[PDB]
Design a protein around this ligand. Sequence first.
Ligand code: BB2
Ligand code: BB2
Ligand code: BB2
Ligand code: BB2
Ligand code: NI
Ligand code: NI
Ligand code: NI
Ligand code: NI
Lengths: 164, 164, 165, 162
Amino acid sequence: ALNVLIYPDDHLKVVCEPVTEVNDAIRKIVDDMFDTMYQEKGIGLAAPQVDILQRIITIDVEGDKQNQFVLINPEILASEGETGIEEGCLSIPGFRALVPRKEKVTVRALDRDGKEFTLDADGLLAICIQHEIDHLNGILFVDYLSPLKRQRIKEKLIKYKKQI
Amino acid sequence: ALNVLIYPDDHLKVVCEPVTEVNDAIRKIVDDMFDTMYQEKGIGLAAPQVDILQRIITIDVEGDKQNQFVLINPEILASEGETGIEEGCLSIPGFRALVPRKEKVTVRALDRDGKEFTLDADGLLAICIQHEIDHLNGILFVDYLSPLKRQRIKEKLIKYKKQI
Amino acid sequence: TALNVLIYPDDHLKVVCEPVTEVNDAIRKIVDDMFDTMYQEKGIGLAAPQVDILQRIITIDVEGDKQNQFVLINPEILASEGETGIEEGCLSIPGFRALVPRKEKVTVRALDRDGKEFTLDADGLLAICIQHEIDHLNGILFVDYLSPLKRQRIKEKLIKYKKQI
Amino acid sequence: NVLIYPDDHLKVVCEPVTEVNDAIRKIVDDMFDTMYQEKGIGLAAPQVDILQRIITIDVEGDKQNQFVLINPEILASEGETGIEEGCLSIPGFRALVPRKEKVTVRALDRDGKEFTLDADGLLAICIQHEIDHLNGILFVDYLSPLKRQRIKEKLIKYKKQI
Ligand SMILES: CCCCC[C@H](CC(=O)NO)C(=O)N[C@H](C(=O)N1CCC[C@H]1CO)C(C)C
Ligand SMILES: CCCCC[C@H](CC(=O)NO)C(=O)N[C@H](C(=O)N1CCC[C@H]1CO)C(C)C
Ligand SMILES: CCCCC[C@H](CC(=O)NO)C(=O)N[C@H](C(=O)N1CCC[C@H]1CO)C(C)C
Ligand SMILES: CCCCC[C@H](CC(=O)NO)C(=O)N[C@H](C(=O)N1CCC[C@H]1CO)C(C)C
Ligand code: NI
Ligand code: NI
Ligand code: NI
Ligand code: NI
């Protein structure tokens, strides 16, 4: 466990600093993220969701330490296609939204040992990558809703946070 | 007489929401922005720098108010060339650095009464437009610098903010 | 006594300054005061008559981080080339800028903070600052390249401003 | 009244005249009068504490070939030459000043009409001297720092003496 920030929260809206150096401290943040992610049954997690304002993403679609991706200072280089599934967020518990995404994405990033890599993804991986990168730029799925819908979500989550 | 946010500040790193409605309130904000820009002797200003997280930019290169530019929900249509000047920012006081920029730019935006316009710009104007639209995506000139230089500026400004 | 600056209009902003006879420590103290004034007011260049010292002294730091402080005492342009322009501002003329026709590259000889002679090639902003500050040493401001009308308008705003501050 | 070096107004770059009106023409006439009373062949407004670009020259001394230069500017100039130049604002001193021998100068006359003049010899020299004044430059500024200092100090003590 680290603490998962719930919307609304300023650090869920912040564009994160790139990692300067992928070292031991960073790799502990990565392992701690994986833990929290699995504990919460997430298929991805972005650093700011646990109050760390750095560009670090952990992903595991199938959720069994199989295809574990670490994406540090990631950038989408190319994309194509159109898709959109109903997305939920650990930082926005209890809500879903159809989010228009690119079907296919090609991404560059540093792995947990600091080595650059480039990855082509589609389907769920591609969507999860995009959901996670929005996080790094302080964008949530609610940001694709109407200001009115988003507001109503917000009010409800405020309640849930005093309640918890 | 609105106050300018000083780096580091979470709200200087926020992607701002589109203005949905260019109404009297947005116009009041515009006039307040110009006042602050003039008071603080800037040539441009983005709404987040006065802590208003919407896509509103005010520019006046000469400062005599003859050629005021209001850019609401701006989008760069196209750009080319290269330049850079050691750029300063009211939100990063005392520091300047060369930023790689396009030399010439064409933006579309809404004016003060919500009428669409297109503007072609070069020279300083073009540079300011890019810098100000960068603020709207939660990007500052120090984010183009080495993390080392960015860090020094951050440290020296946290000091200065305490003094204030 | 505060790190303040003469504001246009003022006679001493149009005075032609005399060469420093010797770079002693009244002068080095003027240099350090100028830098502090530049930094206080978030400027990139300064000339001595802007803090009311009628001497040929200029301090420049384009980046603000002190990593590249230039000091130029009794400067002279050996040569220059090309032309350029950027809407220039001045701490002595707050809230205004105007494009001023400048040389793009410039070669300047001057004395450093210790009194030792250097030569500097400069382009870009640096070269524009050098020229702008040398103009100050010769009782010339950016408003003097404008039209009587534009300048008179600026003067009028600035009197008003000076009062209110 | 003629200012005596040192004085900040003898170092001030003067403002252009915007209208050649009657205030200006009185200035011009008051300047010739002062120039002749004090035995000069050239005078510049700041020498009489008027910070505007106005020059009054008479090399002859006879009110015959009087030149008036308002908002002058040099367009061309060739050759080198020199003379032991004095200045009514710097009484009791002269210095050899390297000048252009020939000068081309465009200015407004006494009634604000534009004219352009080629000049040589003494005229040319005074024109340069007198434009220097409008740009805050005195003949002593062509001297070594210590020599300038020396004269400034004597004239400071001379100034008190009256
Ligand atoms: C779809 C794009 C990736 C979503 C990532 C999120 C984790 C998160 O909030 N990242 O910022 C998640 O796992 N959400 C879960 C989720 O929505 N899941 C889990 C299995 C399938 C998928 C349904 O969208 C929740 C509801 C447990
Ligand atoms: C430089 C491109 C435009 C930057 C805009 C800034 C104002 C700002 O903080 N905008 O977000 C500005 O006015 N900058 C000034 C500035 O530093 N300038 C003015 C000319 C270019 C640049 C420094 O070279 C400051 C000191 C008032
Ligand atoms: C750049 C030419 C040299 C001017 C330097 C001045 C400081 C000054 O008054 N020097 O005499 C400055 O810092 N000017 C700034 C300024 O306006 N700049 C920065 C770069 C160009 C110009 C405006 O575009 C101000 C507003 C802080
Ligand atoms: C030639 C340069 C113009 C100098 C004219 C000066 C008058 C002056 O003060 N001009 O600014 C003059 O006549 N000065 C006299 C003088 O000494 N002479 C003799 C004629 C001109 C000058 C020598 O240049 C006085 C002091 C007696
Ligand atoms: Ni999420
Ligand atoms: Ni800025
Ligand atoms: Ni200046
Ligand atoms: Ni004279």
